[PDB]
Amino acid sequence: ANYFIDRPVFAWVLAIIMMLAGGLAIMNLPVAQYPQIAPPTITVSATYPG
């Protein structure tokens, strides 16, 4: 709130914590072109030769 004005070191520590958390997240975060958008579907395949 307003009391962060009197404590610059606390604000800097919070910013450093955010930066470290963001770096750690970027290090291990799944990447893909698109997420799972289509509804789940199950395909059953059978073969009868001839």
Partner 1 sequence: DVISQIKVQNNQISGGQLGGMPQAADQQLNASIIVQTRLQTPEEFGKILLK
Partner 2 sequence: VQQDGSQVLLRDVARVELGAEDYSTVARYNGKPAAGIAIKLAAGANALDT
Ligand X SMILES: CCCCCCCCCCCCCCCCCCCC(=O)O[C@H](COC(=O)CCCCCCCCCCCCCC)COP(=O)(O)OCCN
C-beta closer to ligand X: residue 1 or 27: 1
CA–CA dist 47, 50 (Å, integer): 9
Residue 46 tokens, joined: 């059978």
Residues 10/4, Cβ–Cβ less than 8 Å: yes
Residue 35 interacts with which of ligand X, partner 1, partner 2, none, CB < 5 to 8 Å by class: none
Q: Is 28 in the site for ligand X (CB under 6 A)?
A: no
The single residue among 1, 9, 25, 32 that binds partner 2, judged by CB under 8 A, is 32
CA atoms within a 13 Å half-sphere pointing along the CA-CB vector of 26: 6
Site for partner 1 in 19-48 (CB under 8 A): 48
